[PDB]
Amino acid sequence: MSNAEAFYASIRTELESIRAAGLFKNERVIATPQGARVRTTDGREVINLCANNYLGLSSHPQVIEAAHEALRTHGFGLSSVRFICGTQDLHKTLEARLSAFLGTEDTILYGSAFDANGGLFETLLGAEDAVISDALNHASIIDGVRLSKARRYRYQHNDMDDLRVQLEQARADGARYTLVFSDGVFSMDGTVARLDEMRAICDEYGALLGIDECHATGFMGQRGRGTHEARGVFGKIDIITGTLGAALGGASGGFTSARKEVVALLRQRSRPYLFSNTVAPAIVGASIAVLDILEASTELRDRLEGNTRFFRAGLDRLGFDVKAGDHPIIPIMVYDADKAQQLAQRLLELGVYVVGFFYPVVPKGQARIRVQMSALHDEAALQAALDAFGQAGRELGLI
Amino acid sequence: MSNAEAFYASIRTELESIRAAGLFKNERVIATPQGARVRTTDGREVINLCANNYLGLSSHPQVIEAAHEALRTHGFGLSSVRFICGTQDLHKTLEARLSAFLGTEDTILYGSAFDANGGLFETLLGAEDAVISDALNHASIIDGVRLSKARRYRYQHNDMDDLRVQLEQARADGARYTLVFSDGVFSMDGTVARLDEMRAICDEYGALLGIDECHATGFMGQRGRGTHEARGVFGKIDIITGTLGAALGGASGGFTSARKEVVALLRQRSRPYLFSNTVAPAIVGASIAVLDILEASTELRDRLEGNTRFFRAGLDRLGFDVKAGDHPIIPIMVYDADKAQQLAQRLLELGVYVVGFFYPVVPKGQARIRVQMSALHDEAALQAALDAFGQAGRELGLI
Ligand SMILES: CC[C@@H](O)[C@H](NCc1c(COP(=O)(O)O)cnc(C)c1O)C(=O)O
Numbered sequence: 001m002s003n004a005e006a007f008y009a010s011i012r013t014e015l016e017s018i019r020a021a022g023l024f025k026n027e028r029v030i031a032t033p034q035g036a037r038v039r040t041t042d043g044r045e046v047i048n049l050c051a052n053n054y055l056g057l058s059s060h061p062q063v064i065e066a067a068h069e070a071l072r073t074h075g076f077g078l079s080s081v082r083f084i085c086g087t088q089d090l091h092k093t094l095e096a097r098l099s100a101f102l103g104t105e106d107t108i109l110y111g112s113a114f115d116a117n118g119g120l121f122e123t124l125l126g127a128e129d130a131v132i133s134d135a136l137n138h139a140s141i142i143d144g145v146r147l148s149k150a151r152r153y154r155y156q157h158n159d160m161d162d163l164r165v166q167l168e169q170a171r172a173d174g175a176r177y178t179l180v181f182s183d184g185v186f187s188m189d190g191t192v193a194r195l196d197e198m199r200a201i202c203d204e205y206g207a208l209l210g211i212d213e214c215h216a217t218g219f220m221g222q223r224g225r226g227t228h229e230a231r232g233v234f235g236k237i238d239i240i241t242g243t244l245g246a247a248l249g250g251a252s253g254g255f256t257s258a259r260k261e262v263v264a265l266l267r268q269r270s271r272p273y274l275f276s277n278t279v280a281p282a283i284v285g286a287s288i289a290v291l292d293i294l295e296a297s298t299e300l301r302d303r304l305e306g307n308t309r310f311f312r313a314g315l316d317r318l319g320f321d322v323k324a325g326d327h328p329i330i331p332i333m334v335y336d337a338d339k340a341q342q343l344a345q346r347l348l349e350l351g352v353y354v355v356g357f358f359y360p361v362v363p364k365g366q367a368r369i370r371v372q373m374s375a376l377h378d379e380a381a382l383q384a385a386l387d388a389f390g391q392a393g394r395e396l397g398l399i
Numbered sequence: 400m401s402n403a404e405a406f407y408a409s410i411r412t413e414l415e416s417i418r419a420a421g422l423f424k425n426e427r428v429i430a431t432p433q434g435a436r437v438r439t440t441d442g443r444e445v446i447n448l449c450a451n452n453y454l455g456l457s458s459h460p461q462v463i464e465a466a467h468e469a470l471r472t473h474g475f476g477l478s479s480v481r482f483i484c485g486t487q488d489l490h491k492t493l494e495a496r497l498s499a500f501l502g503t504e505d506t507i508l509y510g511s512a513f514d515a516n517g518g519l520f521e522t523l524l525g526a527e528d529a530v531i532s533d534a535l536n537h538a539s540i541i542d543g544v545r546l547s548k549a550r551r552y553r554y555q556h557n558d559m560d561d562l563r564v565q566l567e568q569a570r571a572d573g574a575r576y577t578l579v580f581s582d583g584v585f586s587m588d589g590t591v592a593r594l595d596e597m598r599a600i601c602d603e604y605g606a607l608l609g610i611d612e613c614h615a616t617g618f619m620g621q622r623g624r625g626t627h628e629a630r631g632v633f634g635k636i637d638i639i640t641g642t643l644g645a646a647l648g649g650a651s652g653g654f655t656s657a658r659k660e661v662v663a664l665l666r667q668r669s670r671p672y673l674f675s676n677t678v679a680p681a682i683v684g685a686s687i688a689v690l691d692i693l694e695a696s697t698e699l700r701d702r703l704e705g706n707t708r709f710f711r712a713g714l715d716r717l718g719f720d721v722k723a724g725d726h727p728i729i730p731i732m733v734y735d736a737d738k739a740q741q742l743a744q745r746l747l748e749l750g751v752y753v754v755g756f757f758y759p760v761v762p763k764g765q766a767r768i769r770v771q772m773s774a775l776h777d778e779a780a781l782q783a784a785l786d787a788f789g790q791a792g793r794e795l796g797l798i
């Protein structure tokens with residue numbers, strides 16, 4: 001029995017036990033563009049309440065046509081990293097508009113938020129330095145930190161007192177520079193970081209504050225600029241990392257926006273920036289028009305707030321443990337992974353597209369459905385969906 | 400002086416330190432689509448010989464039109480990882496086409512080749528297993544290995560006897576499974592991994608064989624299938640990672656190709672596939688068009704081979720060191736960084752766009768210019784660049 005084939009057997013044995021534990025993820029094949037309603041290849045058309053299409057720009061006609069013109073004017077692929085021959089005027093234009101949009105002096109584009117985080121800490125920090133992370137920080141942040149030589153501390157989830165204990169200890173352990181880093185809005189539970197307390201606690205110790213803004217840019221704040229606008233620190237952030245693939249288009253790309261020494265050093269030394277393809281001209285192009293939309297009127301994010309409150313207060317009145325609020329991410333815990341596959345399946349049958357969240361996406365035994373609001377939803381969809389949740393929740397024992 | 404501001408000072412000190420060493424990289428701002436000739440925002444038209452656009456597909460109008468069609472039928476962005484609502488029929492289809500093209504059972508799409516490597520080793524390997532890398536492996540492989548728990552070995556560049564010395568130690572050290580991993584075609588020197596030998600070495604020790612094919616897929620091997628085709632080992636590769644951002648379109652996205660059960664574990668556990676956006680609809684649909692183009696005729700790859708055989712023989716007949724290979728990557732070693740900044744800039748005055756490679760992209764003391772050949776270059780541009788190389792080659796002491 002060969003060594004290579006025992007490996008493949010090991011892998012097959014692993015797959016089985018993932019299925020046994022109710023943890024195997026099955027892909028639905030959508031046959032349509034992204035939007036408020038969606039159709040799998042099988043033919044069924046369902047309400048989509050689990051996309052990152054927070055502002056509904058993934059298939060917004062003026063975003064689609066801006067990408068079209070980018071294809072005409074600036075081509076399909078650049079097949080280069082930025083410093084070689086992958087820099088077009090659009091990249092410089094969009095890095096500018098984001099810096100303006102976000103409150104920072106420059107911005108550096110990446111292929112994703114995942115790679116913006118991956119290349120952040122290693123380039124800026126060393127073994128003598130520290131990174132303090134909220135316990136539930138996103139996997140891409142944990143992997144950025146793992147790739148750096150910095151010392152690591154976690155503070156308990158959104159616990160501002162534990163943030164002080166770690167900052168105390170890191171000072172005590174002798175940290176040169178400290179960077180406090182956290183999801184702006186957290187992926188799996190929707191809660192909002194307390195950037196107002198943190199920027200103050202960071203100011204006592206001289207620490208830096210960085211935030212991952214994927215679940216905030218475009219629709220958090222009065223003018224949609226970020227979680228920092230929503231906590232009144234706009235322009236007081238050392239490091240923003242974020243995506244172009246959530247609210248701002250949903251195609252690809254990410255970014256780090258920081259002072260200008262940072263951005264300049266990231267361009268010089270950040271590994272994904274040096275070593276991975278530049279963003280495609282269509283994406284950069286359509287993102288520049290995305291910023292034209294959101295800077296011209298706050299309506300879409302306003303309709304998002306409305307859709308979110310209506311549906312959060314609705315799931316509340318049905319007995320779900322969902323607080324009233326304006327978090328477009330609405331977590332619905334079912335703990336059992338199998339009971340998550342069922343609830344998502346049953347809600348499919350009832351006309352609602354959600355997907356189970358289980359390990360390793362969330363901790364074993366803390367499985368959930370993550371509802372996700374859009375500006376796209378009209379009230380007969382939000383209503384027909386509330387119906388779907390009340391029934392399937394009743395059948396499965398959730399209310 | 401506060402700690403935060405102290406940190407910014409260290410950033411600018413190293414920003415100035417990097418300029419002082421002449422190691423600072425300045426972005427040239429292309430104003431046109433990627434092409435064999437390109438115009439900076441200054442209006443000057445120049446011959447591009449430093450892109451990964453080997454087959455000219457980056458602005459190929461049939462590729463461009465497939466992106467136009469994929470936007471109309473399938474939208475701009477999906478704003479979701481694959482397992483939630485980011486799997487369209489296109490991704491499944493493109494995944495079947497890459498597997499058949501490449502000789503493998505299945506294929507998993509990533510947002511870049513960077514992330515394909517980044518999510519590869521940590522998923523398939525454990526503390527008891529070994530990875531054995533060619534010492535010149537791409538930065539994305541190193542980081543993917545650093546993110547895994549496996550035991551690490553490096554062997555001298557293309558050194559088959561060093562490769563055996565490591566597999567001895569890996570086994571001596573008690574490795575369970577063992578993965579030999581190397582660039583198929585090395586980005587920085589154009590050399591071609593000795594895959595037929597490595598397959599034989601691996602069979603002996605019972606190790607898996609993996610290749611990163613970013614500089615091979617589409618044009619290496621008689622049918623452009625890649626380094627494994629070119630070395631008689633088509634169909635006998637355990638793991639292919641790669642990119643859609645070079646010869647297969649140049650826009651965005653990457654992949655890992657392997658057996659069904661390896662790919663299935665990557666879908667269930669690979670961190671960038673779980674936690675980062677799915678490839679955009681327009682990119683997937685254009686990639687499907689790229690495979691129709693390349694499966695229909697080995698022109699382009701035949702044309703590429705010609706253009707390089709001519710341009711190598713060009714610098715051949717001028718006292719340039721044609722160091723190693725038939726390959727479209729022509730490394731013109733100049734060792735000193737400042738000279739490569741000079742030679743790249745001087746050629747820009749002679750009408751040639753080409754860029755200096757120096758630390759940390761290439762080792763200190765081993766700076767260079769990477770000439771990269773495309774199918775697109777017409778004879779006018781070719782021998783016109785041969786002249787600009789001859790002039791500046793003598794003009795700056797290298798000829
Ligand atoms: C100067 C920067 C170079 O590293 C670059 N190559 C990028 C690259 C990647 C990342 O591919 P992605 O773009 O992330 O899909 C993965 N593997 C290999 C073997 C590569 O050569 C180039 O040839 O310009």
Ligand SMILES: CC[C@@H](O)[C@H](NCc1c(COP(=O)(O)O)cnc(C)c1O)C(=O)O
Nearest residue numbers: 112113114138140187214243673674675676
């Ligand atoms: C189930 C997978 C989720 O983690 C996923 N997160 C994507 C994500 C990334 C990667 O962003 P990119 O897509 O690579 O730009 C970076 N930071 C944060 C805070 C994120 O939430 C989501 O919420 O859909």
